[PDB]
Ligand SMILES: O=c1ccn([C@@H]2O[C@H](COP(=O)(O)OP(=O)(O)O)[C@@H](O)[C@H]2O)c(=O)[nH]1
């Protein structure tokens with residue numbers, strides 16, 4: 001069998017879409033070794049079913065309490081990303097040298113596009129290099145224009161993108177002192193793209209026809225998304241039993257699914273507004289509040305006041321939740337995976353973007369794909385959230401958003417089915433490796 005190495009950046013929004021691609025490739029006969037940091041491995045709870053080998057490398061940066069890697073990394077981004085880079089180069093080289101003592105020998109390294117320097121580790125080791133982009137082509141295009149200097153990370157017109165306000169650009173300012181380094185890192189994804197053996201994007205053509213066509217005029221790219229299979233689907237604790245039995249008690253189109261993803265943290269004040277909005281709307285809701293973020297919920301919220309209509313849980317099986325017929329809409333921070341998974345599940349969205357590409361995704365959701373509405377800041381107050389919920393759950397606009405979401409779900413299904421663009425591109429990638 002052809003042996004594929006996979007190295008995501010150590011954050012769930014990078015691990016998960018690459019894992020899903022690895023499961024698809026393992027279904028086609030490939031052997032997979034997934035490279036994770038020891039910090040990632042601490043949260044891995046289930047892996048036996050996958051059949052994928054997991055090999056750990058050191059974090060390469062300080063280990064602060066039980067914080068994840070990007071948490072420690074954002075204390076000093078320019079320094080700790082560079083330390084992470086130096087350590088990952090050394091330790092992936094070492095690991096590959098060890099993997100070269102075992103059959104089947106590794107042939108290709110699929111690595112996170114935010115680690116472009118792993119291409120030279122791949123090539124130095126005699127492997128093919130595949131850069132895996134975990135953001136859409138539309139957002140990635142902005143990073144490319146930054147590298148060409150067409151735009152500086154300080155309305156905005158870019159080829160094949162909708163007119164953007166400044167509020168719609170990838171939110172690098174939120175990182176403050178780390179803003180300048182975060183912008184250099186994103187632009188650097190394209191620094192060696194001409195030397196990459198395979199450029200993979202987690203998107204499907206019908207979602208962004210023109211920018212995909214534009215990018216294809218420059219390089220051979222492979223759109224292979226959604227990689228998520230819209231179990232073996234999760235490495236981490238997803239509380240699946242609790243979540244799905246609660247949803248099974250809910251009627252069609254009644255549940256607000258709420259999640260701000262794996263990284264974003266809402267202030268105690270913002271949390272109160274969401275809690276009250278969710279209560280004051282008379283809707284059922286499943287709200288993912290990460291364990292380290294409970295304590296910022298109001299006093300009795302998790303234990304008592306949410307009990308009538310809500311399920312507050314520290315992590316859920318998001319794919320299964322978004323697929324459940326009871327879920328009427330998704331209040332989301334607009335991370336790309338949550339965006340794509342909801343879109344491919346036919347679930348309209350309430351956009352509460354926090355930073356990085358989420359602001360741009362929220363613009364695409366509301367104005368291009370037309371499957372969500374955006375909250376307006378003043379802090380996002382409960383009245384604004386409740387108004388967005390009514391728009392989605394009750395209003396005629398909400399029925400249009402749902403119909404639009406269902407049309408995207410159908411095109412996403414075509415893309416990953418036999419003869420669809422993403423299925424074709426994965427097959428092409430698979431064949432090139434033989
Ligand atoms: O309760 C949850 C919340 C999130 N996710 C997954 O975690 C990822 C979140 O990625 P996203 O790009 O949406 O945002 P990020 O966490 O990177 O900010 C996605 O794979 C979701 O499916 C999950 O499995 N369960």
Ligand SMILES: Oc1cc(O)cc(/C=C\c2ccc(O)c(O)c2)c1
Pocket residue numbers: 009011013014070114134135182185263335336337356357
């Ligand atoms: O190097 C970085 C910088 C950053 O600011 C965030 C991340 C990880 C989180 C993330 C959040 C949303 C996404 O769509 C995504 O691909 C990743 C990684």
